[model samples]
Target: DKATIPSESPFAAAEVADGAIVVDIAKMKYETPELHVKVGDTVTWINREAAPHNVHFVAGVLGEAALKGPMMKKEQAYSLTFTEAGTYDYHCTPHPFMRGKVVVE
Candidate 1:
């Protein structure tokens, strides 16, 4: 299941403070295409400095699963909580040129 959170949430704030990584979406790319995380850690992709993006995932590239999301409008965000440990590769659905990876240990 996937959902969007209110930008004013305290949990999101605390999560970031507690080490959640932030990936920016803009410039026809995910500004931070590659990230390193750990089990139970979360990665938040937020639309910054621009608009129109969706986080796309391919099975086996990460822990053998595929995840797709709706187009993120301006300032919209998405979060993925990594459970299994492995390297997950993903990209932008609208722009195939945009690719990203999450290395979870």
Candidate 2:
């Protein structure tokens, strides 16, 4: 309700922010690889390294809100708004070792 940011729309095992969360992708890893968030929270993943990285879901992770990304260069960003409760997993398309997850509760 009041905790939700009208713009942000909006983690644990990652970072738990009542509103929005910012995840950084650098050094071939997600800074906060796991996140705990509420149903209405929004997560913004930004590419901090000067290379191409992407966030992708394998199976039931993305659901309807398939908010993935482009082969982003430095400073590029992708934002997703979670509308329900579930555990979501994601990874970088170019680098399989670079993985992350979002726990929506």
Candidate 3:
């Protein structure tokens, strides 16, 4: 399955507010509060802190290759798309403390 970034992840919901979708990476967890979305929905995970972060989804969970990138230096962005239906659980490789989910329906 393809993945969407900077919008929604397997860990957090992509909330559209003020003309933008936001993912609170610092307040999320590696487990629980699983992210949810629908097929064809685009999700993005934005690193809103000073620390570097990477989005990684295990194989069979979302895609074969892990989706990762450096933290956007606050206000920067990264994204992926949920083209299949499944529960995707992912985490930040650089910062274990940050995690999230993306459920495609």
Best by lDDT: 2
After superposition, candidate 3 runs with Cα above 4 Å error: 4-21, 27-33
Clashes of 3: 27
lDDT, candidates in the order shown: 0.68, 0.69, 0.59
Candidate 1 backbone clash number: 1
User: Which of the predicted structures, 1 or 2, would earn the higher lDDT when compared with the native?
Assistant: 2
- Write the residue-wise lDDT of candidate 3 on 53-85 in tens digits: 667776667666655554444444566767788
lDDT of 1 by residue, 1-105 (tens): 222233322222223434557887878888988898887777888765455778787754544356665566667666777776778788988888889988888
Residue 103 in candidate 3, Cα distance off native in Å: 0.8
Q: Give the winner by lDDT: 2 or 3.
A: 2
lDDT assessment of candidate 2: 0.69
**What TM-score, computed on C-alpha atoms, does each candidate reach?**
0.75, 0.75, 0.68
Q: Could you give me the TM-score of model 3 versus the true structure?
A: 0.68
Cα displacement (Å) at residue 75, model 1: 0.5
